[PDB]
Amino acid sequence: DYIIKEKTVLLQKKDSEGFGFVLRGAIEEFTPTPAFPALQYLESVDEGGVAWRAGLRMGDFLIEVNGQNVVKVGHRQVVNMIRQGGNTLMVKVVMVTR
Amino acid sequence: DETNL
Predict the structure, then answer these.
(1) Handedness of CA A14, A10, A75, A69 (dihedral sign)
(2) A66 by DSSP, 3-state: which?
(3) Chain-chain contact of B5 with A20 (C-beta, under 8 angstroms)
(4) Any bridge partners for residue A13, and if so which?
(5) Total domain count, chain A
(6) If phi over 0 gives left and psi between -120 and 50 gives alpha, with beta otherwise, what is residue A46?
(7) Least CB-CB distance to B2: which of A19, A22, A82?
(8) Nearest residue on chain B to A26, judged by CA atoms?
């Protein structure tokens, strides 16, 4: 079986810091499966970080960046889309279990 | 490929 937990969070950081996560991902012909529901995912998240306090964890997959779907969007364009918002980031992720 | 955010 699969347990898919969708969670939508708003990340608010200061100028002198980061969101506190490492985005990893990726070709491009992508078929979302329950195990891999997206391409880009959080490889690590800094404990007590902005992202971390927001609820986000290692393994979460990035579905949306600021209301816009990034399910099939490349790594470059996603990092690029994250920077676009500056200190505010609304992100929609999925935590896949079992 | 990775990025620190």
Answers:
(1) negative
(2) coil
(3) yes
(4) none
(5) 1
(6) beta
(7) A22
(8) B1
Report resolution (Å) to 1 decimal. 2.7
Domain coverage including residue A22:
1-98
CB-CB under 8 Å, B1 with A18: no
Q: Does A22 touch chain B (CB under 8 A)?
A: yes
Residue among A19, A20, A43 whose CB faces B2 most closely? A43
For residue A40, which of A91, A97, A88, A98 has the smallest C-alpha distance?
A: A91
Q: Does A79 touch chain B (CB under 8 A)?
A: yes
Separation of alpha carbons A21 and A5, rounded Å: 19
| Contact between B5 and A21 (Cβ < 8 Å) | yes
Instruction: Read off the CATH number of the domain in which A33 is found.
Output: 2.30.42.10
Task: Give Cα separations from A16 to A21, A43, A76, A87, A90 (angstroms).
Answer: 15, 23, 23, 10, 19
Experimental determination technique: X-ray
> What is the enclosing helix (H) or strand (E) of A43?
strand A41-45
